[PDB]
């Protein structure tokens, strides 16, 4: 099962220059708890952007060219990716822009963090069709002292 896990801000920005402007502690633990243990594939820009392994994952790295870095594994291709993940229940797909365009049609399930924070950004979730998901899930949380903005977490499976 491929599952595409992101946090958007408003009109569905994720980025911008290759940073994620926004600090939102809670939903990096929501991030970390959805994806520890299991494989996580990611673009190279978004390698670039996070700037280390993630621990505690298999970090699979999309890219054209050869990787330069043999703590992680890199892939030239989608199925290349899905293939070096293994036999596993369920593989994350951590973006980005580009990545989460490839792989959503062969998802199953969304973990998006909805972010109420305008952001110029560059970079945008896919423009994906709201009826083919079927919301299971949904955690409303206002800011608080940690927290400087209110996010929803939900989790959709495709109908
Ligand atoms: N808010 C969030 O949830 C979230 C999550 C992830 C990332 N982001 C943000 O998203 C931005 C990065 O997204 P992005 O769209 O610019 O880049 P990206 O999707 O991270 O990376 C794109 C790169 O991945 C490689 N790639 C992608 N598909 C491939 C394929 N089928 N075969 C081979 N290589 C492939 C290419 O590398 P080569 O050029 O080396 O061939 C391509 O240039 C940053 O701002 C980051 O902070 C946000
Ligand atoms: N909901 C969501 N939030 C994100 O911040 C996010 N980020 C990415 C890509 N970028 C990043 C950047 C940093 C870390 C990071 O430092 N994660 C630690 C945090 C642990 C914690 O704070 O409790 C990790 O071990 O996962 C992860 C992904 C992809 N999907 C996402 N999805
Ligand atoms: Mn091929
Ligand atoms: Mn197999
Ligand atoms: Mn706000």
Redesign the pocket.
Known sequence: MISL????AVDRV???????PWNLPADLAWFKRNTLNKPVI??????E?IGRPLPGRKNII????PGTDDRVTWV???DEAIAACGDVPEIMV???????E?FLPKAQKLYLTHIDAEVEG??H?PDYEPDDWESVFSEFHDADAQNSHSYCFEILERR
């Not at 951590?94 to 989460?100: A, C, L, P, S, T």
């Open positions: 896990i992101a946090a958007l994720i980025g911008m220059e290759n940073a994620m990611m673009g190279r820009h978004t390698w952007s999309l890219s054209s060219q030239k291709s989608v951590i973006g980005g822009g580009r990545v989460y490839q560059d970079t979730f």
